[PDB]
Amino acid sequence: KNFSLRIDELEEMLTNNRIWRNRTVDIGVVTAEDALNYGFSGVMLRGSGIQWDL
């Protein structure tokens, strides 16, 4: 019950911050084909637009 408010506090802290974005907006861009051919699984696929969950 209380963990949703905890996640809301964390997302208020980190997501909207501009300094947090400046370290993460254009860092480590991986294409879908290069993620598939490198044996990536999980979030590495799901952050690249590949719809795949076990």
Partner: protein
């Protein structure tokens, strides 16, 4: 028997959605507040600087009066 089970009606609601209330004012309000603060500061500074110029002129003419004896 006795085990760990949920009740007959189940448990209460549990949230899983992002909650950002969007608290604050519009841009026009804060910009107008800043402009009004700037205008108030400019007016107060103009009044105090004119008074300080008059005081400096008075002190300078005091030195003008005191110069020949020195």
């Amino acid at each position: 028997v006795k085990q760990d089970m949920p009740p007959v009606g189940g448990y209460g609601p549990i949230d899983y959605k992002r909650n950002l209330p969007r608290r604050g004012l519009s841009g026009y309000s804060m910009f107008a507040v800043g402009i009004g603060a700037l205008l108030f500061g400019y007016w107060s500074m103009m009044r105090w600087n004119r008074e300080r110029r008059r005081l400096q002129i008075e002190d300078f003419e005091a030195r003008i009066a005191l110069m020949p004896l020195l």
